[PDB]
Amino acid sequence: MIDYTAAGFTLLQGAHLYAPEDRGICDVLVANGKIIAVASNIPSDIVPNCTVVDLSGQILCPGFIDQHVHLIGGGGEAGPTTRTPEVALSRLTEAGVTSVVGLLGTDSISRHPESLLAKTRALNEEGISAWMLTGAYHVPSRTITGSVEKDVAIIDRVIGVKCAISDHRSAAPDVYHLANMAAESRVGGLLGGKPGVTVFHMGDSKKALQPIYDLLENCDVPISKLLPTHVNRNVPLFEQALEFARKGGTIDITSSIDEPVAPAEGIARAVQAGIPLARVTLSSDGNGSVAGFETLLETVQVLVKDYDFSISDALRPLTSSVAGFLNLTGKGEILPGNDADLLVMTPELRIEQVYARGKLMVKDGKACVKGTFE
Numbered sequence: 001m002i003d004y005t006a007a008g009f010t011l012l013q014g015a016h017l018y019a020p021e022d023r024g025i026c027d028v029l030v031a032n033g034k035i036i037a038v039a040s041n042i043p044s045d046i047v048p049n050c051t052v053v054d055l056s057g058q059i060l061c062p063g064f065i066d067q068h069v070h071l072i073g074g075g076g077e078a079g080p081t082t083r084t085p086e087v088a089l090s091r092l093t094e095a096g097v098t099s100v101v102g103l104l105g106t107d108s109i110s111r112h113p114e115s116l117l118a119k120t121r122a123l124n125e126e127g128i129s130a131w132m133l134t135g136a137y138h139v140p141s142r143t144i145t146g147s148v149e150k151d152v153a154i155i156d157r158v159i160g161v162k163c164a165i166s167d168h169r170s171a172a173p174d175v176y177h178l179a180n181m182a183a184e185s186r187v188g189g190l191l192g193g194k195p196g197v198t199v200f201h202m203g204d205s206k207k208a209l210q211p212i213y214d215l216l217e218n219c220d221v222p223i224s225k226l227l228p229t230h231v232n233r234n235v236p237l238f239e240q241a242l243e244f245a246r247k248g249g250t251i252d253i254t255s256s257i258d259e260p261v262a263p264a265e266g267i268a269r270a271v272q273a274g275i276p277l278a279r280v281t282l283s284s285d286g287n288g289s290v291a292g293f294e295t296l297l298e299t300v301q302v303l304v305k306d307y308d309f310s311i312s313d314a315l316r317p318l319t320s321s322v323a324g325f326l327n328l329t330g331k332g333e334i335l336p337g338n339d340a341d342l343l344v345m346t347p348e349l350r351i352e353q354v355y356a357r358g359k360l361m362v363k364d365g366k367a368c369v370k371g372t373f374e
């Protein structure tokens with residue numbers, strides 16, 4: 001016989017496919033880490049060496065895209081002892097994360113972008129999709145190449161810049177330095193084919209989003225580039241984030257915070273406020289604090305259970321919404337052409353199998369592919 005296993009053909013059949021938009025019992029043909037077919041009832045012999053897998057009675061949706069992870073570690077806000085460790089591959093793949101955006105937090109003295117870049121690339125080699133934000137709470141930003149615009153532009157894995165405002169751990173940035181920073185991220189993005197966003201870590205200051213509004217006055221960076229996070233950290237601020245989302249901006253809610261506005265409670269209030277889910281994403285801020293990624297899947301579950309969101313609508317803030325905000329071409333959605341980043345769940349939404357770019361990451365709910373030193 002002839003050898004065709006080079007194509008790594010795999011057919012996920014008979015599952016209740018949510019892409020996230022609720023389709024029916026659809027089949028998904030995968031080849032070379034790519035979804036090459038999506039139409040109910042596909043032949044188990046349509047292609048040669050095809051690893052056919054029976055997912056009858058199971059749910060099939062896109063893997064999660066988590067855009068807030070301290071990949072190489074974080075913390076340190078209470079001495080060097082509080083410096084959290086780096087993130088383990090299995091930790092991510094088990095929480096159903098197939099695409100992630102790394103970043104640095106408060107500590108930008110013992111944590112450098114070159115290391116994050118390195119960890120991001122190491123992750124991509126191991127099986128998942130990783131990107132990173134340059135800078136840290138600090139403004140002006142400590143970059144790799146000398147300027148934010150240059151980083152976003154020519155460093156292949158940088159998709160935008162991060163920073164921190166209305167927080168007691170900022171660098172006390174002024175509107176000009178802030179505006180300039182975002183403008184560089186925006187221009188850089190265009191030159192590099194990157195979303196060129198600016199993610200703002202929100203603190204507990206009364207000022208809240210005022211700096212983000214002040215910025216809009218002093219420059220012309222589209223509001224579709226300014227992403228505030230941890231908006232659910234205090235109610236007064238959350239309320240403003242909603243108003244900000246009502247103006248066309250997107251808001252990021254961290255699943256690692258459970259009060260005063262819980263994650264689900266957050267995604268929920270937004271809908272009630274009348275915000276298209278498109279402008280709402282959910283991040284974990286994993287390995288921060290030591291934060292974990294369990295709360296991502298838990299926010300989906302609780303959304304479908306405790307609140308009255310549907311499986312499809314619950315998934316959005318963790319997939320398509322995120323994908324559409326960073327312009328992560330080929331992700332967060334199951335269609336021919338897109339990447340075979342998949343999650344096999346039980347009817348009760350309990351991740352059983354995980355697929356990343358075709359390769360199988362989680363077999364029995366436990367990763368079967370791990371980082372080099374786990």
Ligand SMILES: NC(=O)C[C@H](N)C(=O)O
Nearest residue numbers: 105201202230285288289
């Ligand atoms: N001090 C804090 O509230 C923690 C910080 N917001 C973090 O992202 O971990």
Ligand SMILES: [Zn+2]
Nearest residue numbers: 105201202230
């Ligand atoms: Zn933060």
Ligand SMILES: [Zn+2]
Nearest residue numbers: 105201285288
């Ligand atoms: Zn953080």
